[PDB]
Amino acid sequence: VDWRFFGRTEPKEENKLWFSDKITDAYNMPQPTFDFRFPAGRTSKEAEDMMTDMCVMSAKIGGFLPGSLPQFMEPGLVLHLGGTHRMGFDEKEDNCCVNTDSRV
Amino acid sequence: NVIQGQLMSVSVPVNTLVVDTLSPTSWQASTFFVRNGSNPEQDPLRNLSGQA
Amino acid sequence: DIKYDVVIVGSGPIGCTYARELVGAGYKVAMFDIGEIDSGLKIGAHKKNTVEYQKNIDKFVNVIQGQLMSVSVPVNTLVVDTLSPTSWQASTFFVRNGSNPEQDPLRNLSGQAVTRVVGGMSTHWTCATPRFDREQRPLLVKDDADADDAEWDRLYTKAESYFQTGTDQFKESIRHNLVLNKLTEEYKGQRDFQQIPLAATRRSPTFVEWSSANTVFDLQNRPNTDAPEERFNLFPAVACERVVRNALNSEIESLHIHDLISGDRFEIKADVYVLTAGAVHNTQLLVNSGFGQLGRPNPANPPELLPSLGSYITEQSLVFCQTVMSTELIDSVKSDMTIRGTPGELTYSVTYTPGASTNKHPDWWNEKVKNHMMQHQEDPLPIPFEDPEPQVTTLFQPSHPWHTQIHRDANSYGAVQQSIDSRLIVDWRFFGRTEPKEENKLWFSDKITDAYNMPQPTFDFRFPAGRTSKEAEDMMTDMCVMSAKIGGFLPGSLPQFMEPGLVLHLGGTHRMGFDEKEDNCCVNTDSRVFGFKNLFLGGCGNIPTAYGANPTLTAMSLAIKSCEYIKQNFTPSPF
Amino acid sequence: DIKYDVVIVGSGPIGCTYARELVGAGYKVAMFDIGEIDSGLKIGAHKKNTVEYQKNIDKFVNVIQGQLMSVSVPVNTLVVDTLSPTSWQASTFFVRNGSNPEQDPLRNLSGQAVTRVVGGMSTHWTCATPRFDREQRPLLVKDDADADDAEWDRLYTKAESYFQTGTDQFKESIRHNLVLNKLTEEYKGQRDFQQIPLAATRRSPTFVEWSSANTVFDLQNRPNTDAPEERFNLFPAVACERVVRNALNSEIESLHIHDLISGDRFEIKADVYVLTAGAVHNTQLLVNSGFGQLGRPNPANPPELLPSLGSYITEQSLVFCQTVMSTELIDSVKSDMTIRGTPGELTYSVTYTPGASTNKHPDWWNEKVKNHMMQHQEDPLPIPFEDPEPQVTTLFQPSHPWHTQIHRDANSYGAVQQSIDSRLIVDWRFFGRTEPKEENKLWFSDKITDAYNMPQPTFDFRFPAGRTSKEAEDMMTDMCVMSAKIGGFLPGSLPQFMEPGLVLHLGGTHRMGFDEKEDNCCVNTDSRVFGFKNLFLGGCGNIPTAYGANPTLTAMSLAIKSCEYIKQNFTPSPF
Ligand SMILES: *Cc1cc2c(cc1C)nc1c(=O)[nH]c(=O)nc-1n2C[C@H](O)[C@H](O)[C@H](O)COP(=O)(O)OP(=O)(O)OC[C@H]1O[C@@H](n2cnc3c(N)ncnc32)[C@H](O)[C@@H]1O
Ligand SMILES: *Cc1cc2c(cc1C)nc1c(=O)[nH]c(=O)nc-1n2C[C@H](O)[C@H](O)[C@H](O)COP(=O)(O)OP(=O)(O)OC[C@H]1O[C@@H](n2cnc3c(N)ncnc32)[C@H](O)[C@@H]1O
């Protein structure tokens, strides 16, 4: 049995996706670059509590499979990235790019 | 395998693994230069390396 | 000579317990070890007591691996199908490379190993010497817990003296504190945390004299200048092969030995015979001497002599991981500091106020941190470089019936784990207790022989399925829950059960009880083999209970008691 | 005392060469080692000379690894990005875990390591002691090859005596034969194959006394019963830190030592000072004493004193693989047998005709094979279980300028390689010669310090690009071609270059020649430091040529010559 637990990440202004003005990708488009760390208070506390919860819960069903021991996966392997062009009601107040009709 | 085959990494930092068992005749790097489509902008320690 | 008062087989810490007590009481003692002197001029000492190991501690893992020889290796069934067509290629999984064809690979203690050197495993051990609580502890007196308690307290106190056990050697460690203080805060006062009791004496802020067999007894031949009235001879590179029983099985009449240098075989006569060859090798020697039953067990023919020998074996479940210290704990180190500027720059400053009461830490700590931070501005951690390692435990209790060690063992890191600063890394080892079950056995082949031409050991073992297994998995969970309080797992050192028997805490192979039949056992509470006037067994093989704490101190305590019996019942020869 | 005739720094086989010669000639000798006594009661002996290692030989790889401490480890730049979010995580690749920030990871000898124990590396070495042919050999006499030849033959013969070198210890090995005899057939008579010259004496069909420092000199303090007129003291756990130069750089005036047990520092006076701390540590001691240049090299400021010190360093390229013996070679073992029936069945028979001339093998061989095949019908190979290992070489020659070893080292097999019967496995190690080049350097940090608070060693090394590199790759090909004659590669042990400096054959760090300036060198042919009356260096650091054979016998031979000079030029103190 496979166990995947997915945590929630606080949005923080410092966590960014930006694009090089000189390096280009395979389609000759500006190269994407990340500047990301999981936030340090709630997000991180929850992430480690979530690991513990997986350990506690999974033990109810059986022991770990050798070779598939509890671990955090490579950041972003989950492919659930959000907030890169985020929605809110007010561009300035809610620090956002699209409104609730997804209109820029 | 089908999944892995269509996940192309977003941002791969410059590689800094030391390969020091090359044969003496083989061309050997003097620096960790930009190779194999890596992104020199990328801090390897502030990445989403798994993003694809 | 060919005649001694006492002969002791094995120069481990248990054999040395016998030598200490009996040599000191005036007996003419010989000790034989199959292994050789190889710890320096202190015979049987800890091999980690060199300046070079303590300056390069992770290299010691290699010394340990080098003297752990697997007990029973099943026939290998890995398929190598990328040989060149010209290379000779097997048609079957035949017996190769010293493997044991008797061994079921699925009912093994594959991790079990033995150490054949003067001082035994005490030349490499971790030196943890906790006492067992009543729940884990063999009864020495029945129907009187107070008398039982009093006897164990006396014996344990003596054994702690012999081993130089202490709980203070790591008290000025930042990391030790950081860990202990965090954990004790988190358990509602219901789990006490203390320093691991360690058989060791600190000589300096960077050197620890770890104890060993040599601490217990120096293994020098006597008479000597320092002990001119004592009589002791150690004979290394001598395989002890068989004790000779009389017809009544009331006495041992000689010990057959094989000198491995000369090749010659002798017989040695003693008044008293003590076997302290280890939990495996005691059993092997006895079975090669007609005790129990040689060959694959067969219920349709139970042994007449010592029927419980090699049955009811216990080995502990062991779980392990490492962690990387949390950001919050690392920031806590430097909580009392005012920090201005950026490291490496002209304006950077780190200060604290001596003797202040808003401060979380005492001055010794804050000075160490301040000085490290100001003198090593290239270094991003507040922990001094030479900070001693953590040595933390919450001992076995009824509500959490496992032993815990939260510490640092000498470790071999993969290159990527050498990526993480060692100051951040903490090792977690939790040790479970195993119910004794008749079906769990150590037996010896009647046809296959080991490297010393002795009957090949074979295990038939599974962890019991109810309590033992339930607890083992609860213990894994407990490690996961507890470790998360200190930091996340270190990649490459994720939570796992270790190979069965890698823990090397095997017990019960020649177990103790009050009554041979009623308690399914081989030795009595004086460690005397039932029926025999003059044969005694020492070691963890004696321990008949399910225990999770490290067993050696307990084995030593039983040996002290056995030595008292010998002192009460055998007269030494005149000097 | 604080005054001796001779002081020797290092108790390796080279320091012991000095002790043997000088103690025997009546000098009052002190020897210091930073490491401690740890081979048993034979001080500085080979650690593989226990019964237990020779019955469990692959475990010895661990003893070796345990006493190889890396010289220079670059800052680690592996990315660990699977830490838990709570764990403290680096923002940079900072200096961790004793790494050397001076070190370019791409111009290193990462495999280089040192051994700090009494007897040095000779407590673990493989004991191969070939002579160098003229092509590899330093000149001791110029313009007279006959006189040069005669001097080397004398010195090598003496050194072979000291080490107990022999070429006969493996002659009754089936595997040794199988290999050697096949290869010699295949090279048109143009490459001779012989046994590797080994510093060892066989004591039985299953025990070999490997030589070491202890063989050369027993390291016991003198006077003693056996040498009542000799004067020798060994002081372990003493770091030698600096020799003190006079103003003229014509004499050494004292040696600063640091007792690592007590912590105390002393100065020792001698008439003669010999440094035999190894190729790395000789250099370190000299640089910490004002020889050469401390810090990162700078051509705009060449050292006045010993400008070639730490330049022109050589280390050998090493290629390795293992093979699995061919089916044809295995069938050849049993070529003289008539075999009828199937193993394990009533009718099965294996016979040969004693003394017959159609037979490929002699009777000793055919009896061994027949008896193995008939007594072990469960076993599918014709090779006896205890057959000694192969020990084959074709020595360096102009047409193939590399040393070769075709043998068995103690090996740690992956579980899948433990799949293959050890009788089938042969190790191949080919060692190339490296041109000395000024740009190839060993230097010492002016700010970073090692574990003994001595200037941190740093390498700036690449294998030269023309001859050295061409030969190294030709040598790889030669191993591939030659090994295929015996069998295919063992999966997991495919042909490869080993980590630079893992071979531990470093030379030229304090090199010998006739003229300091003309020959870019530090010591003369008496191993005397130019300019200094009373300072001598011993070891492989002296060897100034490109060599592929194992260097120690050559270093020993130079030390014998140096000892002759001391005997000719210094009077021992009266006893
Ligand atoms: C290996 C090890 C052990 C260890 C440990 C960590 C490691 C890696 N950490 C421990 C700890 O922290 N606390 C503790 O209580 N135990 C720990 N251990 C295990 C401990 O070392 C052993 O429990 C203890 O050493 C056992 O003592 P004992 O004296 O009973 O046995 P021994 O040390 O194995 O010595 C036995 C000797 O007998 C010899 N021998 C064996 N067979 C023969 C024969 N046939 N004839 C003659 N002599 C024989 C051995 O050579 C040996 O030296
Ligand atoms: C490790 C090894 C080496 C080896 C080999 C295989 C292995 C795994 N196989 C070899 C072989 O088959 N043939 C051969 O010729 N060489 C092989 N070797 C290498 C060989 O062991 C060495 O070349 C030889 O041991 C070098 O001898 P030397 O006497 O010059 O040096 P050493 O053994 O390294 O001993 C040096 C000693 O000096 C001490 N020391 C170091 N620093 C100090 C300071 N500052 N103060 C005081 N003493 C110091 C060391 O502790 C040491 O013991």
Closest in A59, A64, A72 to C496, CB measured: A64
Residue D510 counted as an annotated binding residue: no
* Beta pairing partners, D209: D201
**Which B residues 1-52 touch D at CB under 8 Å?**
13, 16-18, 20-25, 28-31, 44-45, 47, 49
CA-to-CA distance for C497 and C501, rounded, in angstroms? 11
Q: Measuring CA to CA, which residue among D544, D509, D15, D541 is closest to residue D273?
A: D15
Helix (H) or strand (E) holding D321: strand D318-325
Q: Measuring CA to CA, which residue among D528, D510, D504, D487 is closest to residue D436?
A: D510
DSSP D199-244: EEEEEETTEEEE--HHHH-----EEETTEEEEEEEEE-SEEEEEEE
Peptide bond into D105 cis (omega under 30): no
Distances in whole angstroms, Cα of residue D484 to Cα of each of D183, D337, D423, D424, D477:
10, 26, 17, 14, 11
Distances in whole angstroms, Cα of residue C337 to Cα of each of B23, C356, C378, C423:
52, 12, 18, 20
- The owner of tokens 């929605």 is A87
Task: Please tell me the distance in Å from A60's CA to the nearest CA on chain B.
Answer: 30
CA-to-CA distance for C542 and C505, rounded, in angstroms? 12
Reported residue count of chain C is 575
* Exposure class string for D282-293: b at 16+ Cβ within 10 A, else e: bbbbbbbbbbbb
Reported residue count of chain B is 52
3-state secondary structure of C507: strand
**Which C residues 118-177 touch A at CB under 8 Å?**
none
Contact assessment for residue C307 and residue C429, using Cβ atoms and an 8 Å cutoff = no
Alpha helices in C43-121 (DSSP H): 51-54, 60-65
Distances in whole angstroms, Cα of residue D433 to Cα of each of B21, D133, D440:
17, 12, 14
Resolution of the structure, angstroms: 1.6
3-state secondary structure of D287: helix
**Which C residues 470-509 touch A at CB under 8 Å?**
473-474, 476-477, 480-481, 484, 488-489, 491, 494-497
Q: Measuring CA to CA, which residue among C495, C500, C502 is closest to residue C109?
A: C500
Structure tokens at D186: 């295949």
Ligand in closest contact with the CA of C538: 1
- The owner of tokens 């025990």 is D207
CA angle D75, D77, D80 (to 5 degrees): 130
Could you say which of D176, D407, D505, D510 is catalytic?
D505
Residue C260 CB contacts under 8 Å (≥ 6 apart), including other chains: C34, C237, C238, C239, D51
Distances in whole angstroms, Cα of residue C556 to Cα of each of C152, C396, C527, D540:
11, 20, 11, 50
Helix axis angle for D145-163 and D13-24, nearest 10°, is 90
**For a pocket test of ligand 2, which of D48, D69, D125 has the largest count of ligand atoms closer than 8 A to its C-beta?**
D125
- The owner of tokens 């350990």 is A55
Closest residue in chain D to residue B12, using alpha carbons only: D79
- The owner of tokens 């190993």 is C113
List, as residue ranges, the binding site of C for FAD. 14, 33, 117, 120-121, 124, 126-128, 240, 552
Q: Which protein residue has the closest C-alpha to ligand 2 atom 52?
A: D120
- The owner of tokens 């760390």 is A37
CA-to-CA distance for C322 and C318, rounded, in angstroms? 14
D25 CA distance to ligand 2 middle (Å): 25
Q: Measuring CA to CA, which residue among B33, D90, B10 is closest to residue A20?
A: B10
Could you say which of C407, C505, C524, C542 is catalytic?
C505
- Residue C542 DSSP class: G
Active site residue D505: yes
Determine, for residues C50 and D36 on separate chains, whether the beta-carbon distance falls below 8 Å. Answer: yes
Residue D454 counted as an annotated binding residue: no
- Tell whether D439 lies on the interface with B, counting CB pairs under 8 A: no
Contact assessment for residue C220 and residue C211, using Cβ atoms and an 8 Å cutoff = no
Active site residue C505: yes
3-state secondary structure of D285: helix
Q: Is the CB of D211 under 6 A from ligand 2?
A: no
Structure tokens at A49: 């509590």
**Quick count: other Cβ atoms within 10 Å of Cβ C264?**
9
CA angle C401, C405, C408 (to 5 degrees): 165
Helix axis angle for C13-24 and C145-163, nearest 10°, is 90
Contact assessment for residue D546 and residue D434, using Cβ atoms and an 8 Å cutoff = yes
Q: Measuring CA to CA, which residue among C562, C564, C572, C508 is closest to residue C540?
A: C508
CA-to-CA distance for D148 and C18, rounded, in angstroms? 64
D163 CA distance to ligand 2 middle (Å): 14
C509 CA distance to ligand 1 middle (Å): 14
Backbone angles phi, psi at C358, to 5 degrees: -75, -10
Determine, for residues A72 and D86 on separate chains, whether the beta-carbon distance falls below 8 Å. Answer: no
Alpha helices in D339-430 (DSSP H): 363-375
Determine, for residues D81 and A75 on separate chains, whether the beta-carbon distance falls below 8 Å. Answer: yes
Determine, for residues C326 and D37 on separate chains, whether the beta-carbon distance falls below 8 Å. Answer: no
Q: Measuring CA to CA, which residue among C510, C515, C441, C474 is closest to residue C104?
A: C441
Contact assessment for residue C163 and residue C556, using Cβ atoms and an 8 Å cutoff = yes
CA-to-CA distance for C329 and C317, rounded, in angstroms? 30
Q: Which protein residue has the closest C-alpha to ligand 1 atom 6?
A: C125
Displacement of CA D416 from its chain's centroid (Å): 29
Contact assessment for residue D384 and residue D370, using Cβ atoms and an 8 Å cutoff = no
Determine, for residues D106 and B20 on separate chains, whether the beta-carbon distance falls below 8 Å. Answer: yes
Contacts of B16 in chain D (CB under 8 A): 77-79
3-state secondary structure of C557: helix
Residue D121 counted as an annotated binding residue: yes
C152 CA distance to ligand 1 middle (Å): 22
Helix axis angle for C13-24 and C552-569, nearest 10°, is 30
Judging by beta carbons within 10 Å of its beta carbon (0-12, 13-18, 19+), is residue C57 exposed, middle or buried? middle
Q: Where do the domains of chain C lie? A: 1-325+388-575, 326-387
Distances in whole angstroms, Cα of residue C506 to Cα of each of C352, C414, C498, D226:
51, 29, 14, 47
3-state secondary structure of D397: strand
**Nearest atom within ligand 1 for CA of residue C13:** 29
Residues framing ligand 1 (Cβ under 6 A)? C 9-15, 32-35, 64, 115-117, 120-122, 124-129, 239-240, 276-278, 281, 285, 504, 539-540, 550-552, 555
- The owner of tokens 């030379």 is D507
Q: Is the CB of D7 under 6 A from ligand 2?
A: no
Residue to substitute from D78, D82, D83, interface A, most A β-carbons within 10 A: D82
Structure tokens at D288: 């910490």
Q: Measuring CA to CA, which residue among C564, C565, C518, C519 is closest to residue C542?
A: C519
CATH number of C326-387: 3.30.1920.50
**Which C residues 348-387 touch D at CB under 8 Å?**
378-381
Contacts of A69 in chain D (CB under 8 A): none
Q: State the distance between the two ends of chain A, measured CA to CA, in whole angstroms.
A: 43
Residue D407 CB contacts under 8 Å (≥ 6 apart), including other chains: D196, D389, D390, D391, D392, D393, D426, D427, D429
Determine, for residues A69 and C476 on separate chains, whether the beta-carbon distance falls below 8 Å. Answer: no
> Mind spelling out the 3-state secondary structure of D53-78?
HHCCHHHHHHHHHCCCEECCCECCCC
Residue D126 counted as an annotated binding residue: yes
Structure tokens at D408: 């068995």
CA-to-CA distance for A91 and A12, rounded, in angstroms? 16
Residue D240 counted as an annotated binding residue: yes
CA angle C67, C73, C76 (to 5 degrees): 130
Q: Are strands D252-259 and D265-275 parallel, antiparallel or unpaired?
A: antiparallel
Contact assessment for residue C89 and residue C83, using Cβ atoms and an 8 Å cutoff = yes
Q: Which amino acid, C202?
A: R
* Beta pairing partners, B39: B13
Determine, for residues A69 and C496 on separate chains, whether the beta-carbon distance falls below 8 Å. Answer: yes
3-state secondary structure of C528: strand
